[PDB]
RNA sequence: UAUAUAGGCGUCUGGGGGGAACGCGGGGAAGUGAAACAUCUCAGUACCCGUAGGAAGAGAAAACAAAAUGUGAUUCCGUG
RNA sequence: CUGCUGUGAAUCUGCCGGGACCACCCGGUAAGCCUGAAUACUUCCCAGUGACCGAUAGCGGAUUAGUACCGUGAGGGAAU
RNA sequence: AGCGAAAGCGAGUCUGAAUAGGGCGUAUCCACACAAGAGUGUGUGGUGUAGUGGUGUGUUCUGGACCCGAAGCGGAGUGA
RNA sequence: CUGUGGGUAGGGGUGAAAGGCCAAUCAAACUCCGUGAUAGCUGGUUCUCCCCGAAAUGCAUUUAGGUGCAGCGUCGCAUG
RNA sequence: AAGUCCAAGAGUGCGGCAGUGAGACGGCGGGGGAUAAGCUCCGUGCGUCGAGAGGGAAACAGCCCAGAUCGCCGGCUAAG
RNA sequence: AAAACACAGGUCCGUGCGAAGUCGCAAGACGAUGUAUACGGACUGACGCCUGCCCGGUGCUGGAAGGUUAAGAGGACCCGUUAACUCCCUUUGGGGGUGAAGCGGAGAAUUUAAGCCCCAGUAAACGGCGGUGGUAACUAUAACCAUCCUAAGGUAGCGA
RNA sequence: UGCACUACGAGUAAAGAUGCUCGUUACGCGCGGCAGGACGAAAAGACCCCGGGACCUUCACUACAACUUGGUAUUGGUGC
RNA sequence: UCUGAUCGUAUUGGGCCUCUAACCUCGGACCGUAUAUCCGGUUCAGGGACAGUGCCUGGUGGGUAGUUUAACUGGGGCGGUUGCCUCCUAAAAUGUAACGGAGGCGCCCAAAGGUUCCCUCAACCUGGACGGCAAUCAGGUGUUGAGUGUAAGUGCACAAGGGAGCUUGACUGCGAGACGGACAUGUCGAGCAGGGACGAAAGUCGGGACUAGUGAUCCGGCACCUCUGAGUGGAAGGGG
């Protein structure tokens, strides 16, 4: 009902974060701006 | 008969230049989602083994 | 019979860790609490779990500001 | 044995890394020791260092610049640290890596 | 059952069994330890089988090492 | 490296070994052998040794000793 | 001679784009300065760092492991 | 019913079945060996005196009559 | 800030060696019990026994006095 | 020493005969110098009256079409190294993309057994063998009213 | 069979005393008897619990002995 | 010959009927052999390419074997419990037991996080339409009495409670001096690149008012890495 989701950077496709959403409340792949360390700037991060 | 070294201790502990026995902290292998990065950093790296366990760790490492 | 009780959490060892007059480094935990029984005072900060710690060094001083017990750090002049 | 609870040699993680079977390790001698052993300077090879008792007899010698160099030395070691080479040159000597 | 054979007759030559240890080749436990236990250990131990000899097995690299005009059968010690 | 089961190659532009495969590169020419010394042991014999025992010790056995005795037996097994 | 997981570098090293701080090391101690009073640092200059072989002793490791004691387990045999 | 001579043997025999009998022992005989099995258990552990001197708590524990570490003793150093 | 300070034979740190980890009763504070138990579980820079002789409670580990270095056929006392 | 075992009698099951079963690694043996009116096994236990219902669970005995289903030479694809292709720097050589022959991996489609799933039997196989409650069920009672659930509801007989 | 010139009552005590307290009783030593005590002897309680065994059971686990598949030795003219 | 019904050969396959030669027969007769229900040679008669066991393979498998079948526990069993959080026990620091008294927890968050800025909630009428105890938004009155996502507390009205704007501070990467700390887990993060807004300047944030919402190590997965790569090149594998 709330899986461990892995957010990856859209630019480098580095799996950077592991959060938990609710698959029901927010079924769509989560999109939030966080910075990959290797990129440096906050870039859009999406579920794997 | 040579004194055999404990393999597990040999693999989990190390000595520094001065001789301090160092170890990595537990709770950093898996189930890392909920752990705040502050806890993960606190657990990161090596620390000297506590004085209480220093004796038995040294005995296991020497023989 | 059988009692439905028998449980209790591990005591968290709360309370004041530095009392008024104790000199502390910049960062020492002055109090541990669940709410804000003590509110942070001058050069005292409040942490995530409501821990009062010293933002600056010096002696702890318990006071009251507007009917709220407060923990302050008064600087200690180097002699 | 620790009473049956997970021992300290099992509840702690194994230290990270590998030992690198092929690691090339150097017996090191510092330029301060070069000074102390050779106040006269001169050619200082692995044989000279071993004779003066600064490195093991059959080993890859490396030179490090920890002390201070004040004499002309023609050192010859498998490798030289940057500081060791710099001090060897500054003292009017030469650092032939061989 | 026919060239032809299993076998039968006669003669020489050997074998048989014992032996404490060591050898080689096979089979191969369990108590035990793992503070339980099965992997594992015990242990290739005990025991068992087959076999030698004064010794035996291995032995003269289609080897090992790594760029050294490297060593050059095996075995056995010390180290590693 | 090896056992049992199948499948099963070429003979030097061959084949192995380098802990899978290469312009590779090195080691070289297996699938048949015999080979002393260095090594292990002491039933037995000889000459010695002991900061070994000294008759409840030392071999079980200084005398009858694997005897007497016990057990159907394997076996156990003294005392002096 | 350490740091690190090694290309490794080396009185430094690891972490880190980030001379950002920390970890671990540079025996120890003394003086000089520069700094900051966040608990002291930074360099500079001094004396120069102490292991390692026997061996005693106490613990300890592998062995029977201070000594005695099971019921039971295994191997090979003996018994109707 | 019984004599004599036989046969069946240990995870096996035999059992008009009692788990009975299998050499005064049988819910797996006996002897030797593994073997000085192992036992968190019980017992025992031998001369003296001088100094100090506990603990029976905490945590954890396939743990609760065991053990690890801490607490408390002692002996060395260091601070004083 | 003093006191104790030719000592408490103190505190702290690091090492060698531990033993202990079954506690008992008494006073006080409490839980369980019936605000029974010589009950049970806690707290107590509380005590004593444990590990403590001596005097008193008659006898009587835990109560009161009092902590035995030895010898006196000396004296003063504690509880009583 | 019995109420237990056995027993003669019964029933079921197995067995086409170096049988089944058993001792054996095996050979061989017993069974049996026997032959289905014989053997082995299970239960019951003379004899007499009888052994009523149930094959749902589990065994056994047959198999209904499927599905699942190891061991293989079914070996797509993919992956390693590279003869070689292309291009960048850079030019007395290393940076990407494509990459045959091969040899070396991991290997999917497809592929057929038993068993399982599944259908029918089997209770002298292990085992099962209720309610209603509306009746006069007779108010000693066996059926009857017509009722839910399974596979069925304990039939005769006996019973402190 | 630790002792011994081994009383009784009420007590106290590890809560059932020949051995301790305060009393009571009792000349020493035997002999024949009886069995109330010495928590009498016997057998390191067969109960209970804990630890460990063994054997037994089973839709406990893991194995192993006892049935199907592939090709191997089985084998082909012309077959479908 | 390209989509393509049929091609005839040779190679190799699932299956059915078989020809006998493998192999089998405790079916017969012979001979070794005077003795012989042994066995093994010949032969005949049957099976037959099955069966048999060999290797590998699936199933059934207490038939046998080795084992495991927890502790606490006012004896043991039955029952109950075992980890975490909150309270009282708990003797005004910390801590403190019982099979003591009570409850919660193995979650919810993409907003219920961050940040800026605003607001206060209960309880009664002058009074109201269907409108009642309770709706309204009736503020008209009334002093912080409700509400905190969720147990309990400690807090919160200054708000931590109620609203909106933007946004993704789980600064993720690097990390202060410090501290909470039998051995195995927590509080601030002052600084750094890169952010978030609101804005306007100043400004604050390392998920939540706080303490539960979790599981060491070992083993392996999966991504990225300027790490190693058993002669060298890669590769496998390993490492971070």
């Amino acid at each position: 009902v709330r899986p461990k989701i892995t957010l990856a950077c859209e630019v480098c496709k580095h799996r950077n974060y592991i959060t938990k959403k609710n698959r029901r409340n927010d079924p769509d792949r989560l999109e939030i701006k966080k910075f990959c360390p290797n990129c440096g700037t906050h870039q859009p991060h999406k579920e794997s | 008969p040579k004194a055999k070294t404990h393999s597990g201790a040999s693999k989990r502990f190390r000595r520094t230049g001065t001789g301090k026995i160092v170890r990595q902290k537990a709770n950093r292998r898996h189930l890392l989602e909920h752990k705040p990065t502050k806890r993960t950093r606190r657990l990161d790296g090596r620390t000297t083994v506590s004085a209480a366990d220093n004796s038995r760790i040294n005995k296991l490492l020497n023989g | 019979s059988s009692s439905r009780n028998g449980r209790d959490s591990a005591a968290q060892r709360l309370g004041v860790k530095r009392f008024g007059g104790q000199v502390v480094k910049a960062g020492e935990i002055l109090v541990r609490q669940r709410g804000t029984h003590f509110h942070p005072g001058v050069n005292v900060g409040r942490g995530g779990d409501d821990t009062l710690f010293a933002l600056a060094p010096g002696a702890v001083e318990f006071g009251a500001k507007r009917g709220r017990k407060t923990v302050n750090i008064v600087p200690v002049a180097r002699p | 044995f620790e009473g049956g609870q997970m021992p300290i040699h099992m509840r702690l993680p194994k230290l990270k890394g590998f030992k690198n079977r092929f690691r090339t390790e150097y017996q090191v001698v510092n330029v301060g020791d070069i000074n102390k052993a050779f106040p006269q300077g001169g050619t200082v090879g692995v044989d000279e260092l071993v004779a003066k008792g600064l490195v093991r007899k059959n080993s890859l010698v490396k030179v490090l610049g920890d002390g201070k160099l004040t004499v002309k030395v023609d050192v010859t070691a498998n490798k030289f640290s940057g500081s060791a080479r710099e001090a060897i040159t500054a003292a009017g000597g030469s650092a032939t890596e061989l």
Side-chain angles (χ1 to χ4, degrees), chain D residues 5-6 8 10-11 13-14 16-18 20-22:
Chain D
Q5 68 165 16
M6 191 65 38
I8 190 161
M10 293 181 69
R11 71 173 174 267
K14 296 164 69 178
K16 80 189 184 176
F18 60 101
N20 181 235
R21 185 179 295 276
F22 315 109

Side-chain angles (χ1 to χ4, degrees), chain A residues 7-8 17 19 29-34 43-46:
Chain A
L7 304 166
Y17 305 126
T19 55
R29 293 150 70 96
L30 202 64
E31 268 280 0
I32 58 184
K33 278 189 76 184
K34 293 182 162 195
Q43 289 153 323
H45 270 74
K46 179 172 253 185

Side-chain angles (χ1 to χ4, degrees), chain A:
Chain A
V1 165
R2 296 181 65 88
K4 294 186 183 181
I5 77 179
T6 292
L7 304 166
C9 184
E10 293 293 328
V11 178
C12 52
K13 305 300 298 186
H14 271 71
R15 301 199 179 97
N16 276 315
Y17 305 126
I18 189 165
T19 55
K20 295 178 68 175
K21 65 181 183 293
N22 189 328
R23 63 171 180 177
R24 304 261 181 61
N25 291 326
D26 292 293
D28 291 331
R29 293 150 70 96
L30 202 64
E31 268 280 0
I32 58 184
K33 278 189 76 184
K34 293 182 162 195
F35 81 85
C36 183
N38 86 335
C39 282
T41 61
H42 290 64
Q43 289 153 323
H45 270 74
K46 179 172 253 185
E47 199 146 349
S48 290

Side-chain angles (χ1 to χ4, degrees), chain C:
Chain C
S1 59
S2 303
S3 56
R4 282 81 203 169
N5 312 320
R7 304 164 298 283
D8 216 320
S9 67
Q12 308 306 330
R13 290 141 182 77
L14 299 172
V16 179
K17 308 305 183 183
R18 299 292 182 277
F19 295 79
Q22 294 202 235
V23 180
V24 294
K25 313 276 186 68
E28 292 202 357
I29 286 163
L30 311 185
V31 174
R32 282 195 170 278
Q33 42 173 345
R34 302 295 79 167
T36 55
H37 184 50
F38 303 104
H39 287 255
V42 311
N43 298 269
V44 169
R46 178 195 171 193
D49 64 0
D50 305 334
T51 300
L52 303 191
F53 58 97
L55 296 168
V60 182
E61 192 285 359
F62 285 84
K65 273 209 151 203
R66 204 177 297 175
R68 302 197 308 185
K69 292 157 178 164
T70 298
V71 188
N72 289 309
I73 288 283
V74 305
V76 175
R78 70 211 182 203

